[PDB]
């Protein structure tokens with residue numbers, strides 16, 4: 122689903138100007154300011170966000186286009202490293218992630234990931250691991266983000282400050298609401314609520330005492346007629362023949378309903394991380410200081426088990442595997 126936000130530029134530049142200029146120095150206060158300001162989002166944008174939050178969509182994403190972004194010459198050099206400096210001045214697309222994110226829920230960091238920070242720069246780096254956001258020339262395969270984590274976030278949000286030079290990197294999304302009807306009833310029933318072994322991403326590795334301790338992911342779960350999805354092409358590891366066959370049918374169906382989005386400066390993509398898998402196609406970095414640059418945050422909501430009380434936007438949570 123898409124919303125053209127161009128006509129909102131003046132109002133959104135104003136809301137961004139309400140926010141602290143050095144977000145990370147007091148991230149709790151920054152995100153509280155963003156929550157207050159989110160009450161003043163333009164009405165039709167607020168409606169689109171609240172509708173998507175409550176209901177999702179058939180295509181599993183909400184793309185906001187034409188948000189105020191700095192001119193390319195007015196941005197810093199694309200980052201080369203992580204974590205970001207705590208003193209880094211606010212970027213307009215970060216302000217947008219604050220406002221839009223707090224309209225939806227609570228920004229969440231993961232202790233073991235990206236030094237326990239909340240805002241993540243997504244840029245290409247040489248020598249990237251094949252599952253990393255740092256990849257460029259190799260396809261980043263379909264994944265639900267952190268499907269294996271008990272505190273998996275409801276949304277992944279990606280805001281673009283720079284696209285890659287040739288605008289060849291496409292962000293791919295595949296929605297369970299489009300894939301499910303392509304599956305037959307026997308496949309749906311095998312997948313639904315069935316725990317399967319799932320490896321974890323690099324950041325979360327170690328301390329796995331025995332095969333008992335391996336994370337368990339239900340590739341479909343919840344209401345049989347409108348299930349949630351948990352899928353990771355590389356990390357999900359079904360063991361019985363009937364499980365491998367059912368996951369292969371799911372994989373095929375997700376490919377057949379793939380949608381491609383080319384993120385450009387000013388775009389903010391909201392992925393329904395309980396109903397959709399995402400991926401990124403190849404591109405060739407130039408190592409020139411102007412490579413592709415996204416900002417990523419994770420948002421928790423009241424849906425399903427994410428929150429148990431007292432959480433704040435900006436909290437950083439520890440790892441517990443699903444079981």
Ligand SMILES: O=C(O)CCC(=O)C(=O)O
Nearest residue numbers: 243254292399400401417
């Ligand atoms: O680079 C992209 O478009 C998406 C990368 C991604 O999967 C993520 O940052 O979670």
Ligand SMILES: [Fe+2]
Nearest residue numbers: 264266277399
């Ligand atoms: Fe991702």
